[PDB]
Amino acid sequence: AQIGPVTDLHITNANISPDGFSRPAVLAGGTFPGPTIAGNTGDNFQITVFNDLTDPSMLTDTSIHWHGLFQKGTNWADGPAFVTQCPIITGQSFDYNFNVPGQAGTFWYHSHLSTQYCDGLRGPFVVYDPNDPNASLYDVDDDTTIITLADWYHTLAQQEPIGAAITADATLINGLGRSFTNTTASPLSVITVQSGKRYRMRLVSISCDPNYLFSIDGHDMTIIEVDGVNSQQLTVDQIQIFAAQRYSFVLNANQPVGNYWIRAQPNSGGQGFDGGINSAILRYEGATVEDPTTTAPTTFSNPLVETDLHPLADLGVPGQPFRGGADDPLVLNLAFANGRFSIDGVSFVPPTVPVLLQILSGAQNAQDLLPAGSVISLPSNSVIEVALPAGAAGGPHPFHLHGHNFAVVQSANNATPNYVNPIWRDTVSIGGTGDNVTIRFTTNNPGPWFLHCHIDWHLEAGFAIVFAEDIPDTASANPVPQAWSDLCPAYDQAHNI
Ligand SMILES: *[C@@H]1O[C@H](CO)[C@@H](O[C@@H]2O[C@H](CO)[C@@H](O)[C@H](O)[C@H]2NC(C)=O)[C@H](O)[C@H]1NC(C)=O
Ligand SMILES: *[C@@H]1O[C@H](CO)[C@@H](O[C@@H]2O[C@H](CO)[C@@H](O)[C@H](O)[C@H]2NC(C)=O)[C@H](O)[C@H]1NC(C)=O
Ligand SMILES: [Cl-]
Ligand SMILES: [Cu+2]
Ligand SMILES: [Cu+2]
Ligand SMILES: [Cu+2]
Ligand SMILES: [Cu+2]
């Protein structure tokens, strides 16, 4: 069952074996992935998060972010540790009480403390639209049509050795999959469809790192939503999905009754499908209970290319139709050296006092804010452009902005910008060497919004800045509850800070 929009959510430690290998984890709702949190557009979510964690090897503090939800007037509920709150300590709870006006689509939630979401605190978050303009394109849209793609590690996140390469040990589709080494024939996920029906498949990358080449043998996929933004229909036979992105696609159960492989090939870790790694099963009702015998093509006919996507609505692009054609045009210098990432020469290290609390306490320019050089002010009611030229090691980097979606004026692997009808989204691959992926948005949401690579290992290694949007109006726009004001004193006391 789905939970919410008003629910408790307990965060616990438990052993799990999603690929046949047992390890401890950090779980929401007792499962990996966590339960789907759901409601309708405009609803009031009240998610009372109970931190019941006791195993320090995965951190006993926590904080949860609701990825892609704008949090307008509720910046304090956004979740990034040391940006909008101090963490919740063990044995305490915290009510994330917010609204989702003007949004409907496929989102997710995850820990936003250190690399803790990699240890298991990740799940889907769906905001349905009772008047969805895409409703007539499908028959079924429910918990059974959510498809999560996850990387899974045998080594605990906090225990990844300094100086060794980090790669995953399994791809999990709907929480199940097989290990790349010492593969055992552990259970695969089954997605069941009925011949003749049409399904809104909600594809969610809950990855800490790899991008996936996602496909379904024998089928094609008609994209209708990108990171919460309705799209024109775009039929593809493969989707390269980067960490934290979402798509909805229509799956027409229009092939013979049978079993078909679902494929999710990560860019690192195990290559191929030997022993059923990187795989799940699409099973038609009435098919034999057996593995598919289908193959992929050698070359896909219609892979997703981001510039092919266009909004369903007339969203346009704010500003003027040329580089720098914005009120506040930025170009970030994104770099990596010696184990640390930097943005404009500064590697992100979380501050002691959350950025929001510093602002509420009267710090009122970005040069006043800690960490020094990591907080950039944005003016209110302005068109912002951010160019994100690639080249830093470890790419392709999926950059994500909290508090906002954005027009993708320039996409990976294509030097031509689009000032007319590009897709809007919230997480974008910045591509490869020489690319100049560029985003635009307007500043109508006062508060400090994190901008970072969503490869969690890279965030931990500093690949982030905070946009302090409309510092002057942050306090008036974001009244804070007493429980939020209590977080830092409790955290600092527990940690002898
Ligand atoms: C990416 O696009 C930005 C503009 O959006 C480019 O920025 C300009 O950079 C040059 C120096 O390289 C400066 O003289 C300009 O002031 C910048 N802004 C402009 C022209 O609008 C940037 O060079 C591009 N980067 C890459 C790698 O292509
Ligand atoms: C590279 O990106 C550009 C800009 O998004 C794409 O150009 C558009 O192509 C469509 C389809 O032919 C045309 O309707 C638009 O007028 C083009 N816009 C611009 C600004 O040129 C282009 O198709 C992309 N290249 C590839 C190979 O997909
Ligand atoms: Cl967000
Ligand atoms: Cu996220
Ligand atoms: Cu986010
Ligand atoms: Cu990265
Ligand atoms: Cu974030």
Catalogue the active-site residues. 65, 67, 110, 112, 397, 400, 402, 452-455, 458, 463
Distance between Cα 424 and ligand 3 center (Å)? 14
Backbone angles phi, psi at 366, to 5 degrees: -70, -30
- The Cα angle at residue 308 between residues 306 and 314, in degrees rounded to 5: 105
Atom of ligand 1 nearest to the CA of 391: 27
Q: Is 232 exposed, middle or buried (0-12, 13-18, 19+ CB in 10 A)?
A: middle
Contact 3, 48 (CB under 8 A): no
Mutating to test ligand 1, I would choose from 323, 330, 331 the residue with most ligand atoms within 8 A of its C-beta, which is: 331
Report the C-alpha gap between 240 and 334 in whole angstroms: 23
Ligand nearest to the CA of 243: 4
- In angstroms, how far apart are the furthest CA atoms of the chain? 66
Nearest CA to ligand 2 atom 15: 418
The answer, yes or no, to whether any atom of ligand 1 lies below 6 A from the CB of 436, is: yes
Sequence-distant (6+) residues with CB within 8 A of 134 are 200, 224, 225, 230, 248, 312
- Consult the annotation and say whether 397 binds a ligand: yes
Q: Is 123 exposed, middle or buried (0-12, 13-18, 19+ CB in 10 A)?
A: buried
Domains in the chain, ordered, with CATH? 1-133 (2.60.40.420), 134-313 (2.60.40.420), 314-497 (2.60.40.420)
The answer, yes or no, to whether any atom of ligand 2 lies below 6 A from the CB of 416, is: yes
Distance between Cα 472 and ligand 4 center (Å)? 27
CA separation, residue 292 to residues 144, 178, 249, 295, 459 (Å): 20, 16, 22, 9, 38
Pairing of strands 93-99, 122-128: unpaired
- The Cα angle at residue 364 between residues 360 and 367, in degrees rounded to 5: 125
The answer, yes or no, to whether any atom of ligand 2 lies below 6 A from the CB of 136, is: no
Residue 415 has a CB neighbour count (10 Å cut-off) of: 9
Sequence-distant (6+) residues with CB within 8 A of 140 are 197, 198, 199, 200
Report the C-alpha gap between 481 and 380 in whole angstroms: 24
Contact 463, 397 (CB under 8 A): yes
Distance between Cα 21 and ligand 6 center (Å)? 28
Report the C-alpha gap between 403 and 284 in whole angstroms: 40
SS (H, E, C) the chain: CCECCEEEEEEEEEEECCCCCCEEEEEECCECCCCCEEEECCCEEEEEEEECCCCHHHCCCECEEEECCCCCCCHHHCCCECCCECCECCCCEEEEEEECCCCCEEEEEEECCCCHHHHCCEEEEEEECCCCCCHHHCCECCHHHEEEEEEECCCCHHHCCCCCCCCCCEEEECCECCECCCCCCCCCCEEEECCCCEEEEEEEECCCCCCEEEEECCCCEEEEEECCEEEEEEEECEEEECCCCEEEEEEECCCCCCEEEEEEEECCCCCCCHHHCCEEEEEECCCCCCCCCCCCCCCCCCECCHHHCCECCCCCCCCCCCCCCCCEEEECCEEEECCEEEECCECCCCCCCCHHHHHHCCCCCHHHCCCCCCEEEECCCCEEEEECCCCCCCCCCEEEECCCCEEEEECCCCCCCCCCCCCEECEEECCCCCCCCEEEEECCCCEEEEEEECCHHHHHCCCEEEEEECHHHHHHHCCCCHHHHHHHHHHHHHCCC
- Consult the annotation and say whether 458 binds a ligand: yes
Report the C-alpha gap between 238 and 216 in whole angstroms: 8
Atom of ligand 2 nearest to the CA of 420: 20
- Consult the annotation and say whether 110 binds a ligand: yes
- Amino acid letter, 380: S
Distance between Cα 309 and ligand 2 center (Å)? 10
The answer, yes or no, to whether any atom of ligand 1 lies below 6 A from the CB of 479, is: no
Report the C-alpha gap between 273 and 293 in whole angstroms: 12
Distance between Cα 488 and ligand 1 center (Å)? 41
Report the C-alpha gap between 85 and 193 in whole angstroms: 42
Sequence-distant (6+) residues with CB within 8 A of 276 are 178, 183, 185, 188, 291
Atom of ligand 1 nearest to the CA of 322: 21
Atom of ligand 2 nearest to the CA of 419: 20
